[PDB]
């Protein structure tokens, strides 16, 4: 109990940090979520909130507007680990607490996306932890499922399509498609792994290391029905987001890289029976 | 199984909706969620809808402006449940005309479960139900607990306030607050309750019937903290939220007149043991 590495999570009522207060848990982690002061009435926030105590976490109340506040609330753990809507510069104040309280083991900025050093208020966030001197492991390298795999890739909708649908170029871009809570678990394991400290984390599950038409296959073979298919090339392709799809499905910039096995999640952490995406397209039929 | 009562809850994501949705499948009912067309990328709501899937609720694709997709899904239950936010009333116009159409439900529950507005857009609900001879069941009378009592009854935070309250007249005006799970849970049990058919049931559980003075001493006993207490006369507090307030607090509208125990839910169904105030804020300790 004494033993049990400590874990603050900020942003703790976000997609993916809801996820990860849950795997600390899960992991057995003493395990705290930054509860910032409310900006509105705002019933879903406050219940997820008060939800993660019935499971065992503590809520520390800290704003970033109040330095003070946040030094108080990292002097109470081993680890930090952000998840911030993508206010990634906010973890700049973040930063600064850290450094002055001088006992945080490690600290996991909000990345979880494309490897920004590869391509940002991210980097700008890298350098200020490694100015400060604070260990860190950043966790990169995969798509969300449920904002790539449910759509079979298709913007402005998180649901398969029911006839047609666009492949970018030929679909046959290898990208990396993973359930949220496996990138969660995967940062639950590594963030007190000491084979990751300062180091970069790749979430690429070898299974899951898919083109777009594989995944739209996975999916035709589910359903048993073929889908309509229009290619649209790089030129037609050049909204919220374009640009973040041009680099995974035109260029490619989740898998034009090779990783190594000590840096690769799935790899470091065999034990985590990684969600495949035959099996979480299952819910949508 | 055949004899499980078959309802849709349209509404099935939202606050009250998505209990109802749980409770419904707890008592056992062969439960249908109405799934609307996305309106936008929207991750917490298109995964709530289909986290419904794996408790062994099926999803019904319909929408509000396509008459005939609203007769299809109303003639696969028995039973419908609205419940709409609080413009979003008067969208269960439609739901009444399909229903009127399809000739097949034996119950309607339109989005009511708080103040009786018998004593605007909920009567205007109701005429039409009446008028075209639909059986219904109104729930009313409580304050949800989130609202009202987590927040001591404060405006704009939904927390207990840390010193300072204050207390509407001498807050000695008898309010009903009731957690949200026990309101659905006493929805899912008096659906298709043949004593309830065409009936208002009340939800006034006994020992949670209060006034706001009451309330904040189960607090301050809790903490141990007596809170300074700033009275605000009925002609100082004196837009829509404020009238609500205005109504409960100062008019007693939700505890003035007394319910017989055919038409309360505690005594119909004595079996839920609801969550008394005591109870249910202790999860802000
Ligand atoms: N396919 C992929 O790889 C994806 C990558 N990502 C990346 O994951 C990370 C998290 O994104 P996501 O989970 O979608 O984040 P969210 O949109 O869910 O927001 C996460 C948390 O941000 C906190 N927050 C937002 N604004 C502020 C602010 N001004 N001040 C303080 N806190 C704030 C809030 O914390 P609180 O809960 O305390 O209120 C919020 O809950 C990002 O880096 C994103 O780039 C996200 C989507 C897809
Ligand atoms: N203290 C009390 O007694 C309380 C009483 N209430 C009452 O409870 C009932 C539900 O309120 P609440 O739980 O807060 O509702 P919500 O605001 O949480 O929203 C409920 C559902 O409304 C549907 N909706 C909204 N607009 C539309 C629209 N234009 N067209 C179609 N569907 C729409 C959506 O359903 P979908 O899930 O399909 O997307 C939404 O999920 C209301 O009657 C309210 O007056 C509510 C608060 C306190
Ligand atoms: C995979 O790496 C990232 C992913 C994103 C995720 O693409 C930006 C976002 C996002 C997911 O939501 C994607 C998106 C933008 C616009 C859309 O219409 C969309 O539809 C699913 C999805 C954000 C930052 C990243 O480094
Ligand atoms: C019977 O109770 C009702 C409650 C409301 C709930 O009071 C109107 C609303 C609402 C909850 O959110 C309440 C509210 C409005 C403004 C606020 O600042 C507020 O702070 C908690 C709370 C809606 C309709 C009702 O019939």
């Not at 945080?104 to 996306?113: A, D, N």
């Not at 084979?195 to 070898?206: C, H, Q, S």
């Not at 777009?212 to 589910?222: F, N, R, T």
């Amino acid at each position: 109990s004494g033993e049990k590495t400590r874990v603050l999570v900020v942003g703790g009522t976000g997609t993916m940090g809801r996820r990860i207060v849950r795997a600390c848990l899960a992991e057995g982690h003493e395990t705290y979520v930054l509860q910032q002061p409310e900006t509105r009435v705002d019933i879903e926030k406050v219940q997820l909130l008060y939800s993660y105590k019935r499971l065992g976490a503590r809520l520390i109340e800290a704003s970033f507007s109040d330095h003070q506040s946040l030094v108080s609330a990292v002097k109470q753990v081993d680890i930090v680990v952000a998840a911030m809507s993508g206010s990634i510069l906010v973890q700049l104040k973040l930063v600064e607490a850290i450094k002055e309280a001088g006992n945080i083991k490690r600290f996991l900025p909000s990345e979880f996306g494309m490897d920004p050093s590869r391509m940002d208020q991210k980097l700008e966030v890298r350098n200020a932890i490694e100015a400060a001197g604070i260990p860190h492991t950043y966790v990169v390298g995969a798509c969300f499922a449920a904002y790539f795999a449910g759509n079979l890739s298709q913007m402005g909708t998180l649901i398969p399509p029911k006839k047609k649908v666009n492949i970018y170029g030929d679909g046959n871009v290898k990208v990396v498609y993973v359930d949220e809570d496996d990138i969660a678990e995967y940062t639950a394991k590594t963030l007190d792994d000491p084979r990751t400290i300062n180091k970069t984390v790749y979430v690429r599950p070898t299974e899951n290391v898919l083109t777009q038409m594989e995944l739209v296959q996975i999916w035709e073979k589910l359903t048993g029905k073929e889908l309509e298919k229009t290619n649209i090339s790089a030129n037609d392709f050049l909204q919220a987001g374009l640009g973040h799809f041009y680099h995974i499905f035109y260029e490619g910039c989740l898998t034009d890289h090779e990783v190594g096995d000590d840096e690769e999640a799935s790899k470091l952490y065999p034990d985590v029976k990684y969600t495949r995406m035959d099996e979480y397209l299952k819910i949508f039929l």
